[PDB]
Design a protein around this ligand. Structure first.
Ligand SMILES: *[C@@H]1O[C@H](CO)[C@@H](O[C@@H]2O[C@H](CO)[C@@H](O[C@@H]3O[C@H](CO)[C@@H](O)[C@H](O[C@H]4O[C@H](CO)[C@@H](O)[C@H](O)[C@@H]4O[C@H]4O[C@H](CO)[C@@H](O)[C@H](O)[C@@H]4O)[C@@H]3O)[C@H](O)[C@H]2NC(C)=O)[C@H](O)[C@H]1NC(C)=O
Ligand SMILES: *[C@@H]1O[C@H](CO)[C@@H](O[C@@H]2O[C@H](CO)[C@@H](O[C@@H]3O[C@H](CO)[C@@H](O)[C@H](O)[C@@H]3O)[C@H](O)[C@H]2NC(C)=O)[C@H](O)[C@H]1NC(C)=O
Ligand SMILES: *[C@@H]1O[C@H](CO)[C@@H](O[C@@H]2O[C@H](CO)[C@@H](O)[C@H](O)[C@H]2NC(C)=O)[C@H](O)[C@H]1NC(C)=O
Ligand SMILES: *[C@@H]1O[C@H](CO)[C@@H](O[C@@H]2O[C@H](CO)[C@@H](O)[C@H](O)[C@H]2NC(C)=O)[C@H](O)[C@H]1NC(C)=O
Ligand SMILES: *[C@@H]1O[C@H](CO)[C@@H](O)[C@H](O)[C@H]1NC(C)=O
Ligand SMILES: *[C@@H]1O[C@H](CO)[C@@H](O)[C@H](O)[C@H]1NC(C)=O
Ligand SMILES: *[C@@H]1O[C@H](CO)[C@@H](O)[C@H](O)[C@H]1NC(C)=O
Lengths: 105, 132, 113, 52, 52
């Protein structure tokens, strides 16, 4: 409904709709991720080497071929898993038979 | 009384192959890391390679990758090193050593413990000569 | 990428007097996971396989006389012997032990004047 | 003493159970129905719980 | 230096704590009050926490 002859003072930086939108987006984000698989069993050292595929000049060291001993469906078993991680997702670590670990662990 | 005795050395022509065997006694073989170190005549000590207790994790020095393969048999309490494509630069006395103590704690969710002691006990040494 | 060097390649010492062998790493050998520095000292007597003297920067190996003592910073290390006898001379080697790819330095020859 | 219609219906299964302490395990056994477990191939074990 | 009134009230307890990595363990020492410690026989350990 257009309001003819109605002048209203606005202030976009004092608008509480922004604060509500912010809180609603964060809350929905957390609600979405809460009932999901946690990766705490993967906070182990990784044995990482250079990717053996053809690497362009700008991808040298960006992506690494990492391997680790992950848990399985059963508590008493382990499996060796190979995966490619971006350098940004791993950090150097000194260990016996490993080179890197996940940045957030 | 920790003992390590190497055998299987001798003279091999360049391009051939030779397998050394280190027999250990006085300790549980399956509980310790095993290392090979070599010393070329007139040179200092050169680290060659290490094999984990289970044999699942193997690492070689860049200078010996490809040409050397390390393996072990815990039931027989013995360590093997298979040499291929030997170069004249590979003439050396080879020694096997015991590494640190590695333990898998089964009760503690198969946790890993490791105590380092350097290269601990060293063997007698076996000479490998590469010449023709 | 990590190498070891030793300045005193020839260090004759009067028997019964103290001596020390220095060693420098091209990179820090400190392990940030536990704060320990991993560096071993070995001695190869003529005609014998090398034996372990010191494990880690300052931990003496069992069976080693108490005269041998290691010390050092993350990159600058020294092995001191309070008195050197004929039984304590031969070729010494500095071995790095932080990263798994272990290497040895050029070594030094300790002898009796 | 198992009757003709119960042969293989119930199994006596042993396993390494956890305990109230993280670093200790208890060897236990229990009777499971065949419908609760499925065959597994391993070095020391031969069944697992059907839903795991 | 413990006075007579505090004998047995504090103990220096060693244990293997978990750490950031799933398959690593951190050996630690801590001082616990006697009221928080309950005896256990075991083989290696001496006590557990009262609520475990
Ligand atoms: C991550 O998890 C995976 C999965 O659990 C782990 O992989 C396991 O690794 C071990 C060690 O490599 C492996 O065990 C071997 O399995 C072989 C299957 O055929 C066996 O044949 C082998 O036995 C040989 O080696 C033993 C070593 O002592 C000897 O006792 C035995 O007599 C055998 O010896 C033969 O082989 C050796 C080779 O060196 C040779 O010298 C001898 O002459 C002889 O020929 C082992 O039992 C498991 O099978 C692997 N598991 C799976 C499912 O494949 C991996 O190690 C884990 N990683 C980490 C970091 O923990
Ligand atoms: C619960 O866990 C324990 C520990 O992992 C298991 O113990 C294992 O039991 C088997 C029984 O056959 C042992 O195998 C035997 O080992 C001896 C070793 O000398 C060998 O001579 C025999 O021929 C046979 O292979 C096995 O070694 C033992 N494992 C360990 C690590 O000690 C137990 O079986 C598990 N229980 C269940 C129900 O899964
Ligand atoms: C990452 O490394 C693994 C291990 O080397 C590679 O997987 C092996 O690849 C070879 C071929 O190069 C196969 O013969 C093996 O069977 C593979 N092994 C396993 C366990 O998968 C993997 O290809 C590498 N990936 C990249 C992109 O380099
Ligand atoms: C904490 O863990 C260490 C390592 O597992 C335990 O010390 C080991 O105990 C066993 C007992 O059989 C000895 O054989 C090992 O030699 C010990 N390790 C070392 C490196 O010497 C220690 O007992 C554990 N402590 C607690 C309180 O759980
Ligand atoms: C991996 O790539 C980086 C790129 O900078 C290079 O420095 C490194 O030596 C390479 N390593 C191997 C093992 O190829
Ligand atoms: C267990 O009972 C089943 C019943 O069909 C039989 O086939 C099997 O051989 C029996 N096994 C043992 C070990 O007695
Ligand atoms: C430790 O404290 C207890 C408290 O009951 C005491 O009985 C014991 O003698 C004390 N031990 C030592 C070694 O001081």
């Amino acid at each position: 409904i257009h309001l003819e002859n109605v002048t209203e003072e606005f202030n976009m930086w004092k608008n509480n709709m922004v604060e509500q939108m912010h809180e609603d987006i964060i809350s929905l984000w957390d609600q979405s991720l809460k009932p999901c698989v946690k990766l705490t069993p993967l906070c182990v050292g990784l044995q990482c080497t250079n990717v053996t595929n053809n690497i362009t000049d700008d991808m040298r060291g960006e992506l690494k071929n990492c391997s680790f001993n992950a848990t399985t469906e059963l508590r008493n078993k382990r499996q060796k898993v190979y995966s490619l991680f971006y350098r940004l997702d791993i950090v150097p670590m000194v260990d016996l038979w490993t080179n890197y670990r996940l940045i957030s662990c | 009384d920790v003992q390590l005795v190497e055998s299987g050395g001798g003279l091999v022509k360049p391009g051939g192959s030779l397998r050394l065997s280190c027999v250990a006694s006085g300790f549980t073989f399956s509980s310790y890391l095993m290392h090979w170190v070599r010393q070329a005549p007139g040179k200092g000590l050169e680290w060659v390679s290490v094999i984990s207790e289970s044999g699942g994790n193997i690492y070689y020095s860049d200078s010996v990758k490809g040409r050397f393969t390390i393996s072990r048999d815990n039931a027989k309490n013995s360590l093997f090193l298979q040499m291929n494509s030997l170069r004249a630069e590979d003439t050396a006395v080879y020694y096997c050593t015991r590494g640190g103590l590695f333990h898998i704690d089964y009760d503690d969710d198969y946790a890993y413990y490791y105590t380092g002691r350097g290269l601990d006990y060293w063997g007698q040494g076996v000479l490998v000569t590469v010449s023709a | 990428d990590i190498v070891m060097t030793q300045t005193p390649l020839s260090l004759p010492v009067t028997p019964g007097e103290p001596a020390s062998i220095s060693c420098r790493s091209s990179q820090s050998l400190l392990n940030s996971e536990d704060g320990n520095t991993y560096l071993d000292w070995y001695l190869q007597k003529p005609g014998q396989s090398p034996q372990l003297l010191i494990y880690e920067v300052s931990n003496r190996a069992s069976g080693v006389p108490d005269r041998f003592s290691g010390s050092g910073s993350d990159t600058d290390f020294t092995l001191e012997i309070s008195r050197v006898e004929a039984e304590d001379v031969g070729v010494y080697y500095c071995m790095k032990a932080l990263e798994f790819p272990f290497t040895f330095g050029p070594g030094t020859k300790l002898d009796i004047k």
